[PDB]
Design a binder for this molecule. Structure first.
Ligand SMILES: COc1cc2cc(c1OC)OCC[C@H](C)n1cc(nn1)CCCCOC(=O)[C@@H]1CCCCN1C(=O)[C@H]2C1CCCCC1
Length: 126
């Protein structure tokens, strides 16, 4: 399934090249501006523990956050910074770039790998 495909084919977008955040572009976006630290970012997403979703669509609204401000897991600050408006991307994320050994119960156990599909809807500078 889609997590395994990211394992096999995804790009390592970590600075350390530790395969902590792996990415596949599923639909190409437009623009050649990507988000930068500080921007207010609007996305839809579906996420799950890699072993099989929480979705923004379950709440009938986009998920909104400020990029690079630690309002989200590290993997999202790294990954969304690579995305163009209109892009749909898949991320597979090791615990070091998500919730680590502590986890975040009840939704996330210790040492969890996470999978997201993210659509970047829009972004605006602070
Ligand atoms: C660990 O807690 C959660 C994790 C995740 C979703 C969570 C969540 O809270 C309980 O509820 C989403 C809906 C509530 C109303 N909420 C929380 C936040 N914004 N809205 C702020 C959430 C900040 C933490 O989440 C994240 O950084 C990432 C990336 C942004 C979307 C949510 N996300 C998650 O890790 C998801 C998680 C839920 C279980 C399956 C894997 C994805």
């Amino acid at each position: 399934g889609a997590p395994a495909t990211v394992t096999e084919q995804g790009e390592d977008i970590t600075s350390k090249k530790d395969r902590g955040v792996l990415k596949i572009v599923k639909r190409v976006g437009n623009g050649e501006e990507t988000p930068m630290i500080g921007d207010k970012v609007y996305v839809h997403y579906k996420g799950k523990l890699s072993n099989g979703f929480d979705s923004s669509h379950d709440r009938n609204e986009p998920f909104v956050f400020s990029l690079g401000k630690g309002q989200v897991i590290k993997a999202w600050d790294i990954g969304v910074a690579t995305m163009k408006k209109g892009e749909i991307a898949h991320l597979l994320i090791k615990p070091e770039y998500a919730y680590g050994s502590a986890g975040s119960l009840p939704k996330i156990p210790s040492n969890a790998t996470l999978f997201f599909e993210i659509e970047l809807l829009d972004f605006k500078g602070e």
